[PDB]
Amino acid sequence: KIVERPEDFTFMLESAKREATNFFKDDRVILERYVKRSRHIECQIFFDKHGRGVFFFERDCSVQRRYQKVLEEAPAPHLSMETRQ
Amino acid sequence: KIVERPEDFTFMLESAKREATNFFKDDRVILERYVKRSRHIECQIFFDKHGRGVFFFERDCSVQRRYQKVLEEAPAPHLSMETRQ
Numbered sequence: 001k002i003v004e005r006p007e008d009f010t011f012m013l014e015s016a017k018r019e020a021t022n023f024f025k026d027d028r029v030i031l032e033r034y035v036k037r038s039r040h041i042e043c044q045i046f047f048d049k050h051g052r053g054v055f056f057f058e059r060d061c062s063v064q065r066r067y068q069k070v071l072e073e074a075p076a077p078h079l080s081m082e083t084r085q
Numbered sequence: 086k087i088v089e090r091p092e093d094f095t096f097m098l099e100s101a102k103r104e105a106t107n108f109f110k111d112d113r114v115i116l117e118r119y120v121k122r123s124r125h126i127e128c129q130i131f132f133d134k135h136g137r138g139v140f141f142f143e144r145d146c147s148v149q150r151r152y153q154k155v156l157e158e159a160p161a162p163h164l165s166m167e168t169r170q
Contacts, residue, residue, distance in 0.1 A: 005090075080165050 004034060040064075041076060058084055089119060125149075126161060143169055 044056035060076040129141035145161040
């Protein structure tokens, strides 16, 4: 129900119980954090066999259709240096 | 009342009317955007008299006591390059 508002106690249980109808499946319910927006990041890394390595620069794969990569950018635009670190 | 929740119509008017009590002043009320957090920024600039100039780097003055400057940092840490531009 896109219930991003905390202090919700009379609608979440009603929503779950109406979900259980016609979609009983297993009565077990799992709770997680809900994120409104999503942008994919993927840093690169490298390691020898003598205990020494160094991470490469980040990357972005926001654009993808049907789980197929389309176009990507190695420098994640709008990414603070400190974060990169 | 720190009313950051939109779709508020039965509490904002009650809050304003209870504010008017013992603090009538003028009945005119002004509405603005409310920001939860504040951090001060101040960019520098330079201009000749022959129509040509160039902005210097940003700055930060977050730390101040009783409107008195205490400690400041020219490179605003955690500031994306694009924003600087």
